[PDB]
Amino acid sequence: GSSGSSGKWGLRLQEKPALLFPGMAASTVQVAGRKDYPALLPLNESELEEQFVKGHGPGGQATNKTSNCVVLKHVPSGIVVKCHQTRSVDQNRKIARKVLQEKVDVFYNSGPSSG
Numbered sequence: 001g002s003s004g005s006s007g008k009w010g011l012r013l014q015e016k017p018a019l020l021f022p023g024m025a026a027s028t029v030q031v032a033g034r035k036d037y038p039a040l041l042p043l044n045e046s047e048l049e050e051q052f053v054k055g056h057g058p059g060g061q062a063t064n065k066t067s068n069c070v071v072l073k074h075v076p077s078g079i080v081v082k083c084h085q086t087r088s089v090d091q092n093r094k095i096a097r098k099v100l101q102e103k104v105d106v107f108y109n110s111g112p113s114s115g
Contacts, residue, residue, distance in 0.1 A: 038109055043101040049075060050093065053082075072096040079103045 051071040056064035070092040073080040081103065083096040 036109055039105060040101065041105050041108055043074075043097065043104060045097060047075065048072060048097070048100075050096075052089070068092055070096050072100050074100055074104045074107075077104045077107045079107060 051073075053064060053067060053069040053071060055066050056062070067084055068087050068089060069082055069084040070089060071080065071082050072093070079100060081096055081100050083092060083099060085092055085095045
């Protein structure tokens with residue numbers, strides 16, 4: 001075997017610390033809080049397609065009969081509705097339009113329903 005040594009002497013220096021300065025304290029935007037800003041959306045009546053019931057085809061049970069049942073649906077939303085309030089087609093149209101408007105509103109303000 002063998003051995004050895006190394007008397008590595010040395011010196012050092014230092015001084016007192018100095019002062020510092022403060023930093024900025026900015027701010028930023030927050031969440032919306034709410035999430036249902038829109039409601040009862042404008043349903044353009046000139047953008048809809050209606051249908052009229054004259055009877056029903058062979059379907060066994062039920063098989064609807066001739067009535068002033070006006071049918072209305074939303075094109076982009078595909079939601080359909082069948083209302084019958086009076087014997088007047090144009091009165092039933094209005095009533096069908098308002099009920100469809102309520103349904104399309106939530107379909108735009110929210111998502112689908114199980115699908």
